[PDB]
Amino acid sequence: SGFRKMAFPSGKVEGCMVQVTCGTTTLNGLWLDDVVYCPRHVICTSEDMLNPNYEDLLIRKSNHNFLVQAGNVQLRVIGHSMQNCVLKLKVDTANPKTPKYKFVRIQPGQTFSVLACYNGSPSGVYQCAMRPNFTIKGSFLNGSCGSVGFNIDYDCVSFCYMHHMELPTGVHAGTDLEGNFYGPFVDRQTAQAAGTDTTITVNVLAWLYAAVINGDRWFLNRFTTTLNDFNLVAMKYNYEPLTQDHVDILGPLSAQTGIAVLDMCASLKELLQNGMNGRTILGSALLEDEFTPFDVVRQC
Amino acid sequence: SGFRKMAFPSGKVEGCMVQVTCGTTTLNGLWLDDVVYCPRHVICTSEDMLNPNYEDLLIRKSNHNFLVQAGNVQLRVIGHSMQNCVLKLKVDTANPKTPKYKFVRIQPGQTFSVLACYNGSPSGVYQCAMRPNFTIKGSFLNGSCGSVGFNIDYDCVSFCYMHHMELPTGVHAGTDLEGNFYGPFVDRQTAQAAGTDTTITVNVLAWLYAAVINGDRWFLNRFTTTLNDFNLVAMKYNYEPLTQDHVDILGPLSAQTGIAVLDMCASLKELLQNGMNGRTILGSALLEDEFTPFDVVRQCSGVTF
Ligand SMILES: O=C(Cc1cncc(Cl)c1)Nc1cncc2ccccc12
Ligand SMILES: O=C(Cc1cncc(Cl)c1)Nc1cncc2ccccc12
Ligand SMILES: [Cl-]
Hints:
Chain A: It comes from Severe acute respiratory syndrome coronavirus 2. The structure is a homodimer. Chain A is an alpha+beta fold.
């Protein structure tokens, strides 16, 4: 019993964190096999942050301009290339602690663990979700760039995020491990704003199922709803539309608890209308949307 | 920016997790040097659990009755002994991944990271606090016994908790690494109930400072209070008393934000008597009490391990 925001154990990722220095800038890199991946903005100066020409800046660099430190050992860069917004530094040593891994691009609503790092050293691990506006609500200070988001599948690490920047509202933007940004963001200091965020509806429903599995039933009601009526109500509270894919994904939780998805959708509509009235669900006074249907099944 | 419930990086502890099997029971063990530590209830049957004589049950066991598995390698047990509610299995191999470590007993209100394990394999890591009623509000399924709680200080792991059981309310009880239970709990299948819990006041204040550091100031007010008046109010809402030690510990956060501790207590007093009024603090509609003053400083200053 119990329901916690739970991150994956970070050990497999910790053995991959290195420090990358280029001139006066120091950030984190991910060392897998003989390649160190890091945000390409490590090559930028003060004059190169509004409109950097990364191809132009990178061509002026030599391998010895990149200082890579893995623990107290300096690694030798023997090649460099850019793939979208990530810099790939070929090193003369394969990381002996390289886990079984994959690079996966995730969709909004998906969760992942973040190993927040500074100077190539892991400082904390937390859990977050890719918001519908493609930002993440992380906990990051200056120097955290290059920190990664991941999930674990048995013994395989799926790297899904690399931290690049903090937007004016304090939220964070980054890329997959192929350097493709999540969202309409660019690695430039030009004025950028995250779109209005919305609640991840499928995740809230999954968390309501987690609460039922844990014995919390106060919010249940005798009503059901059509998918369309639910979506008309949901949109008014800035909740993401619930698709037939989401209904299908909630099938196993629906089968386990005996509460049909549209029946739970009517509970959610009622909660949105009434609030909680001094009550909590799984120790929370707000509807939690950073647990996917997959997370709920795994944890329960 | 941002404020998350953040656990310590679990790698140093992951390299210590092993699976311990005794008869039909399988749980987790902590392999440090040449000793595997695990809950002594691994030697119990369902009947033994009802009223166990652990000295009697342990004397009947031989080293070969304990199957210890570290990854896909079986370790050989060469000795066994009991220290309070923890079983210590001497193995013929020192764990090459043994980090610098200490066994520390924590106080209620202190936080720590839990590496939840099943079959000697780490499955998740989460941050929690030792409640004032000595339970932890964890997330554990059957097979999680032997999962450990820890903190990291520089490169040293301080092991502070080992999971033993789930109480009827769904909360969890366990011991320090010397086998001494936190709280008035016993390792027996019997009627046990956690006491009425209270809010960790010093931690709520630390989290209010974290909110101010992150730009959330709506709850601040012009008022201050005496420590006695605050404690009279706090006692009424099932909040732990705030001591002069807690006030001193909140000193650095008070200096950084410019809000005296008793000034933040007057904000907390008003939050208690009046509620949040539709507002949130750090994305929460409840006052969070599972971040200590040290956790707030660590997170808002980026300390690494
Ligand atoms: O945002 C940047 C640098 C940067 C700026 N403009 C564009 C790019 Cl691609 C990168 N860094 C930071 C990341 N995360 C949290 C931070 C908290 C404080 C200060 C800096 C932080
Ligand atoms: O509580 C026990 C076994 C036990 C029973 N009586 C006394 C002792 Cl010392 C130990 N196990 C469990 C621990 N944590 C979460 C669990 C969720 C479901 C089922 C079992 C769980
Ligand atoms: Cl402090």
